[PDB]
Amino acid sequence: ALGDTLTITLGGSGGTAKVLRKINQDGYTSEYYLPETSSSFRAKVRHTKESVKPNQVQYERHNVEFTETVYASGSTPEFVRQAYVVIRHKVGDVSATVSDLGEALSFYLNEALYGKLIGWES
């Protein structure tokens, strides 16, 4: 599931919604896209399953990545803005529990914080 469209709401809740469309899905991956004149938005979902080691816990990775590509204009070359998260847990782990850590992160990361981060505050 997840959806046929994916909405990136810039500025968070109540911000500017950008509705991307699913345009491709290969290798446990999805790609949503929304072209515009000045830039384009792309969102990718990826799932991985680290290989089984002889004597080790086997982990799974889930990743979501937002990317705004700003096309080159004038002297200014093309560049990008990008944000993404990764969730990693062992195979049989309790979903609810794992989800809670992700929820904790989303909660932690608000506008105020992002500000400080960009300001190199550790």
Ligand X SMILES: Nc1ncnc2c1ncn2[C@@H]1O[C@H](COP(=O)(O)O)[C@@H](O)[C@H]1O
| Binding to ligand X, residues 16-55 (CB under 6 A) | 23, 27-28, 31, 33, 35, 42, 47-49
Interaction partner, residue 108 (its own copies, Ca ion, ligand X, none; CB < 5-8 Å by kind)? its own copies
What residues from 90 to 119 belong to the interface with its own copies (CB under 8 A)?
Answer: 90-95, 97-111, 114-119
Binding mask 11-50 for its own copies (x = CB under 8 A): xxxxxx----xxxxxxxxxx--xxxxxx------xxx---
Shortest Å distance, C-beta 9 to Ca ion: 10
Task: Kindly tell me which residue out of 100, 105, 116, 117 binds Ca ion, with binding defined by CB under 5 A.
Answer: 100
Is residue 63 a contact point for ligand X (CB under 6 A)? Answer: no
Is residue 51 a contact point for its own copies (CB under 8 A)? Answer: no
104 HSE (CA, 13 A, CB side): 7
Question: What is the C-alpha separation between 86 and 78, in angstroms, rounded?
Answer: 26
Is residue 81 a contact point for ligand X (CB under 6 A)? Answer: no
